[PDB]
Design a protein around this ligand. Structure first.
Ligand SMILES: Nc1ncnc2c1ncn2[C@@H]1O[C@H](COP(=O)(O)OP(=O)(O)OP(=O)(O)OP(=O)(O)OC[C@H]2O[C@@H](n3cnc4c(N)ncnc43)[C@H](O)[C@@H]2O)[C@@H](O)[C@H]1O
Length: 296
């Protein structure tokens, strides 16, 4: 069983690590944006410190280790991200080296969801603004700068509505067979694949996540059939985005990882920021550049 009192554990661990100089929060500023062409909401984060920047999980510094084991099995460590933008940003990393190009185990995806659940005690979408994204950057094109398997868990912003939400609104959880495939928003430019999840975690077992993933991965795989994709997970839904380049073309040339594809863009350069702000649709075009054409 996954550790309890987890959130308190991460938080306590975090302030301590921040206090002690073991991890450095990237200074950043974020504002909302609306794509005037596609309606998509964007959350743009400016972190110019990062423009400075041009297996760390092997023997992690002990101060960054939240739990040396996570479940009963010797399977997982939970780590603090050492260079977070969003505070308390964490890492679910395999006890033993397993490839960053490796696909997620059913227990991979299943352990993730539990971490999500530790973190939001629910009680409503209409009670709290607390909320969390799980993501996995898989393959050279996905934004992965790292080769060891790591699932990332980080707070999402308080008033922000990623397009996936509006996609799954209404829309009972299911799996593609014949009528409706995984959901795809036809307004945006990039191929992506989504399915809603049961409103109750009561209904969420390692089996359902497993099946959801695989089928999403089936549709996203056809974009090759080298191999890279993003995986996004929230309590409300799960998403898979086939991926072509790690870095967008000419207008902006943004390094985009998993976050981009729910609309959260990390910008390291002022001009680009100002360009985005002037014309938010360019984000959508960048997402095309790093991705594949929207197939909806
Ligand atoms: N010794 C160590 N101990 C613990 N962790 C270590 C570590 N060495 C590296 N790491 C961390 O482990 C993770 C590795 O996963 P990766 O998949 O390999 O890389 P990444 O998350 O895309 O971050 P990267 O470092 O490649 O580039 P970026 O400029 O986007 O990085 C920007 C950072 O902000 C995040 N980020 C990206 N987009 C964001 C957005 N829109 N909003 C908020 N945060 C965002 C990224 O996840 C990343 O953490 C990262 O979290 C990394 O920080």
């Amino acid at each position: 069983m996954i550790e309890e009192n987890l959130k308190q554990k991460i938080h306590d661990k975090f302030v301590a690590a921040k206090k002690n100089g073991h991890l450095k929060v990237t200074h950043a500023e974020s504002k909302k944006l609306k794509d005037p062409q596609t309606t998509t909401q964007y959350w743009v984060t400016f972190a110019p410190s990062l423009a400075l920047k041009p297996d760390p999980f092997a023997n992690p510094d002990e101060e960054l280790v939240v739990t040396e084991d996570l479940n009963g099995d010797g399977e997982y460590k939970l780590l603090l991200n050492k260079f977070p933008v969003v505070p308390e940003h964490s890492l679910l990393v395999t006890s033993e080296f397993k490839d960053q190009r490796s696909a997620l185990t059913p227990s991979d995806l299943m352990t993730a969801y539990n971490v999500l659940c530790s973190l939001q005690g629910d009680k409503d979408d209409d009670v709290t603004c607390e909320r969390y994204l799980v993501f996995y950057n898989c393959g050279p094109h996905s934004g992965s700068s790292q080769d060891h398997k790591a699932l990332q868990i980080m707070q999402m912003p308080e008033k922000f509505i990623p397009f996936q939400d509006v996609l799954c609104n209404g829309k009972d959880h299911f799996l593609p067979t014949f009528n409706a495939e995984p959901l795809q928003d036809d307004k945006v430019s990039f191929a992506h694949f989504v399915l809603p999840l049961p409103e109750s975690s009561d209904q969420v077992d390692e089996d359902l996540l497993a099946m959801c993933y695989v089928s999403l991965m089936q549709r996203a795989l056809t974009f090759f059939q080298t191999k890279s994709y993003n995986v996004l997970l929230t309590k409300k839904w799960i998403c898979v985005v086939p991926r072509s380049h790690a870095k967008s073309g000419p207008p902006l040339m943004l390094n985009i990882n998993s976050t981009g594809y729910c609309g959260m863009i990390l910008v390291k350069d002022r001009e680009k920021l100002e360009n985005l702000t002037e014309d938010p649709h360019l984000v959508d075009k960048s997402l095309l550049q790093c991705g594949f054409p929207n197939t909806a």
